[PDB]
Amino acid sequence: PQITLWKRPIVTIRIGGQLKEALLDTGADDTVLEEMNLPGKWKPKMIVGIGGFVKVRQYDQIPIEICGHKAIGTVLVGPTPTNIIGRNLLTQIGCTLNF
Amino acid sequence: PQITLWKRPIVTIRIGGQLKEALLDTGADDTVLEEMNLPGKWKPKMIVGIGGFVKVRQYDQIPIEICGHKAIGTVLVGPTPTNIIGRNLLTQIGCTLNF
Ligand SMILES: CC(C)(C)NC(=O)[C@@H]1C[C@@H]2CCCC[C@@H]2CN1C[C@@H](O)[C@H](Cc1ccccc1)NC(=O)[C@H](CC(N)=O)NC(=O)c1ccc2ccccc2n1
């Protein structure tokens, strides 16, 4: 579908049977979810936001359903005020910006 | 244009006769550029993202050309790690997300 920008481009996501909302964020390199126990091994990572760096945990090959579209990839988990879907997964669902 | 997300959706903007690079950013409410001089009385403003708060200077009704498309709106100026074009201006240039 086409998603307009008058309000925040937030969509339903599904991950491990969890139902959540998330931002479709063309400015995020990476996908950052609020805190949750994901399976598998995680590595610590420092990522940049507008206010500075935060420490997060990187899990790989995590499947996630975005707006009825299957995606599988790297997911970062840390102290974010919002679930954020980044370019790494946005490309997988064929998302473009148009103007 | 249609812009894909395998690389950062970075474009050239023109502002105040200056050319700059900025990130097309659907997950940002606001347009935030690195420190520079703009004409006008400006309000001190605090904004927030990942890593927390940023102190910025709010300039209103600023003309800015984004990839050939003209906008006139609010530009926040401050110690952001990267220039970003947010929804306040993405909407002015008719920008949508599509998959
Ligand atoms: C998610 C992560 C991988 C860390 N990426 C980023 O954060 C990159 C970092 C880049 C380099 C530095 C400058 C910003 C760009 C773009 N950002 C993405 C980017 O799109 C980012 C995502 C985001 C959304 C919501 C909450 C937090 C963070 N937006 C923002 O930082 C902008 C700043 C603004 N006022 O416009 N934010 C917000 O719109 C915003 C909205 C509600 C909030 C509620 C509580 C706390 C913070 C909130 N921030």
GROMACS .gro file of C-alpha atoms and ligand atoms in nm, chain A residues 8 23-32 47-52 54 56 76 80-86, chain B residues 8 23-32 45-54 76 80-84 86-88, ligand 1:
model
  106
    8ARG     CA    1   0.367   0.895   1.210
   23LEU     CA    2   0.751   0.307   1.293
   24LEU     CA    3   0.838   0.264   0.928
   25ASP     CA    4   1.155   0.470   0.943
   26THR     CA    5   1.356   0.545   0.630
   27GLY     CA    6   1.611   0.728   0.852
   28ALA     CA    7   1.692   0.418   1.058
   29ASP     CA    8   1.973   0.200   0.925
   30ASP     CA    9   1.870  -0.065   1.174
   31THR     CA   10   1.554  -0.203   1.332
   32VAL     CA   11   1.524  -0.128   1.705
   47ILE     CA   12   2.428   0.273   1.789
   48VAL     CA   13   2.383   0.646   1.722
   49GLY     CA   14   2.060   0.837   1.773
   50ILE     CA   15   1.996   1.210   1.759
   51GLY     CA   16   2.074   1.243   2.134
   52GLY     CA   17   2.391   1.029   2.121
   54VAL     CA   18   2.287   0.387   2.311
   56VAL     CA   19   2.152  -0.233   2.246
   76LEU     CA   20   1.835  -0.467   1.772
   80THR     CA   21   1.382   0.294   2.270
   81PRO     CA   22   1.055   0.485   2.323
   82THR     CA   23   0.922   0.326   2.004
   83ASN     CA   24   0.950   0.014   1.794
   84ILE     CA   25   1.144   0.120   1.485
   85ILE     CA   26   1.160  -0.063   1.153
   86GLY     CA   27   1.476   0.032   0.965
  107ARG     CA   28   2.065   0.590   0.308
  122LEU     CA   29   1.854   1.233   0.512
  123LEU     CA   30   1.493   1.170   0.409
  124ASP     CA   31   1.355   1.050   0.741
  125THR     CA   32   0.997   0.925   0.789
  126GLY     CA   33   1.060   0.841   1.157
  127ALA     CA   34   1.128   1.202   1.245
  128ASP     CA   35   0.858   1.459   1.317
  129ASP     CA   36   1.101   1.746   1.265
  130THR     CA   37   1.367   1.872   1.029
  131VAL     CA   38   1.699   1.909   1.210
  144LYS     CA   39   1.374   2.439   2.166
  145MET     CA   40   1.436   2.094   2.313
  146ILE     CA   41   1.371   1.782   2.106
  147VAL     CA   42   1.414   1.412   2.177
  148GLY     CA   43   1.506   1.086   2.005
  149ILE     CA   44   1.728   0.788   2.080
  150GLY     CA   45   2.006   0.894   2.319
  151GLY     CA   46   1.772   1.156   2.461
  152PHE     CA   47   1.738   1.532   2.431
  153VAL     CA   48   1.892   1.784   2.194
  175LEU     CA   49   1.557   2.317   1.375
  179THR     CA   50   2.241   1.662   1.555
  180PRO     CA   51   2.484   1.394   1.437
  181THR     CA   52   2.324   1.413   1.091
  182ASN     CA   53   2.106   1.645   0.882
  183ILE     CA   54   1.754   1.504   0.858
  185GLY     CA   55   1.140   1.509   0.876
  186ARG     CA   56   0.767   1.475   0.808
  187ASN     CA   57   0.693   1.848   0.851
  199LIG     C1   58   1.675   0.392   1.540
  199LIG     C2   59   1.823   0.416   1.512
  199LIG     C3   60   1.879   0.293   1.440
  199LIG     C4   61   1.901   0.438   1.642
  199LIG     N1   62   1.838   0.530   1.423
  199LIG     C5   63   1.812   0.660   1.450
  199LIG     O1   64   1.771   0.709   1.555
  199LIG     C6   65   1.844   0.752   1.335
  199LIG     C7   66   1.978   0.821   1.367
  199LIG     C8   67   2.020   0.913   1.252
  199LIG     C9   68   2.152   0.984   1.281
  199LIG    C10   69   2.139   1.094   1.387
  199LIG    C11   70   2.029   1.193   1.352
  199LIG    C12   71   1.897   1.120   1.330
  199LIG    C13   72   1.909   1.014   1.221
  199LIG    C14   73   1.776   0.943   1.201
  199LIG     N2   74   1.740   0.853   1.314
  199LIG    C15   75   1.610   0.797   1.292
  199LIG    C16   76   1.499   0.872   1.316
  199LIG     O2   77   1.401   0.868   1.225
  199LIG    C17   78   1.458   0.888   1.460
  199LIG    C18   79   1.380   0.760   1.499
  199LIG    C19   80   1.306   0.767   1.630
  199LIG    C20   81   1.167   0.771   1.629
  199LIG    C21   82   1.095   0.776   1.749
  199LIG    C22   83   1.164   0.777   1.870
  199LIG    C23   84   1.303   0.773   1.872
  199LIG    C24   85   1.374   0.768   1.752
  199LIG     N3   86   1.383   1.010   1.486
  199LIG    C25   87   1.417   1.106   1.575
  199LIG     O3   88   1.515   1.105   1.647
  199LIG    C26   89   1.324   1.223   1.578
  199LIG    C27   90   1.381   1.360   1.617
  199LIG    C28   91   1.271   1.461   1.589
  199LIG     N4   92   1.225   1.531   1.692
  199LIG     O4   93   1.225   1.475   1.477
  199LIG     N5   94   1.205   1.194   1.653
  199LIG    C29   95   1.078   1.175   1.690
  199LIG     O5   96   0.999   1.197   1.598
  199LIG    C30   97   1.030   1.131   1.825
  199LIG    C31   98   0.892   1.117   1.843
  199LIG    C32   99   0.841   1.078   1.966
  199LIG    C33  100   0.928   1.052   2.072
  199LIG    C34  101   0.879   1.012   2.196
  199LIG    C35  102   0.967   0.987   2.301
  199LIG    C36  103   1.104   1.002   2.282
  199LIG    C37  104   1.152   1.041   2.157
  199LIG    C38  105   1.065   1.067   2.051
  199LIG     N6  106   1.112   1.105   1.930
   0.00000   0.00000   0.00000
